[PDB]
């Protein structure tokens, strides 16, 4: 029943792209805001556009949306990331992986601190 037209979704995306701070979660306010900022002749089209605008607001305010992205949402995407945990960035200096990369560290001159010794059969694939 809500499989609304591409022109309805396109008008709602133009509204949410141009004017984002004018909109909220209340349908009865967002409809009057959309009628102040746009010209729609049909009242059913008014209600449908404003309802999908409220659905886009509930989607954007909850989670990130690729389908529209203003500069304020870009700064929010920048803000949501900087809390960086320090748990597993670099491990302790005990790594055992390969005798082949042990031979690599023997050829190309480095310290080769940790042990590097595994034995594997030829049961690959």
């Amino acid at each position: 029943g809500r499989v609304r037209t591409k022109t309805v979704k396109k008008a709602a995306r133009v509204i949410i792209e141009k004017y984002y701070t004018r909109l909220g979660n209340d349908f009865h306010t967002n409809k009057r805001v959309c009628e102040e900022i746009a010209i729609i002749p049909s009242k059913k089209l008014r209600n449908k556009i404003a309802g999908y605008v409220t659905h886009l607001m509930k989607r954007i305010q909850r989670g990130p949306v690729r389908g529209i992205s203003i500069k304020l949402q870009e700064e929010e995407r920048e803000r949501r990331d900087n809390y960086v945990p320090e748990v597993s960035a670099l491990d302790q200096e005990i790594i055992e992986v390969d005798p082949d990369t042990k031979e690599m560290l023997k050829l190309l001159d480095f310290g080769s601190l940790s042990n590097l010794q595994v034995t594997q059969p030829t049961v690959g694939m």
Binding site: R66, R77, E78, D81, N82, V84, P85, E86, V87, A89, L90, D91, E93, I95, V97, D98, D100, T101, E103, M104, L105, L108, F110, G111, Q120, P121, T122, V123, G124, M125
Partner: protein, 215 residues
């Protein structure tokens, strides 16, 4: 040279991220980048020529005075996180994920750009910028694996672009060398934060679980 040589912190971060191990299939232009094959299918990439191709990629990026002419694109989710913060780091253009083919060809699309250089993550996942390079005359720097084709690629950095920690380590070290060539960060100055922004974040299940365990 003499300061562009690899150090113990660099090789420790390489062995911690695990980029010395690659794919199981060879390519005929990756023989100069592999050194010694290993049992159980996995192959071993050398580190010196990886560092040297990263050095030349940094030289090619710093070689333009305008940093906005360098486009950085990744489609897969292991690189989508690193591309955005790499573009926010120094000067690059943030565009990742769905490429919208026709990005560089037609002009009725508002997402049309005129870059001078392109750096991509995976050639098999970014075959379409490799196709559209041939109409704009721009080079390509690609974080290539041992089983990746090399059509329309000028600088190939041999690595494991499947591991998210490897991809994040490479974008961090590339931005590190680019900023050290630009002069923002000196040589005897480590980076201010551990490279995890460039790595990855797991969404809200075990993220909030570890948060509630760390409260």
């Amino acid at each position: 040279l003499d300061v562009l040589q690899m150090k113990e912190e660099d090789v420790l971060k390489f062995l911690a991220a695990g980029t010395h191990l690659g794919g199981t299939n060879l390519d005929f232009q990756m023989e100069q980048y592999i050194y010694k094959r290993k049992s159980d299918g996995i192959y071993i990439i050398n580190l010196k020529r990886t560092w040297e191709k990263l050095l030349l990629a940094a030289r090619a990026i710093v070689a333009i005075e305008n940093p906005a002419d360098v486009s950085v694109i990744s489609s897969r989710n292991t690189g989508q996180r690193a591309v955005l913060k790499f573009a926010a780091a120094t000067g690059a253009t943030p565009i990742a994920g769905r490429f919208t083919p026709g990005t560089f060809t037609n002009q009725i699309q508002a997402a049309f750009r005129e870059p001078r250089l392109l750096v991509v993550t995976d050639p098999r996942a970014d075959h379409q910028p490799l196709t559209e390079a041939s109409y704009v005359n721009l080079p390509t720097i690609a974080l290539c694996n041992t089983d990746s084709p090399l059509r329309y690629v000028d600088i190939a950095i041999p690595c494991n672009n499947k591991g998210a920690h490897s991809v994040g380590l490479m974008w961090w070290m590339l931005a590190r060398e680019v900023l050290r060539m630009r002069g923002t960060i000196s040589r005897e100055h480590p980076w201010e934060v551990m490279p995890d922004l460039y790595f990855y974040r797991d969404p809200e299940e075990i993220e909030k679980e570890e948060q509630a365990a760390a409260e």
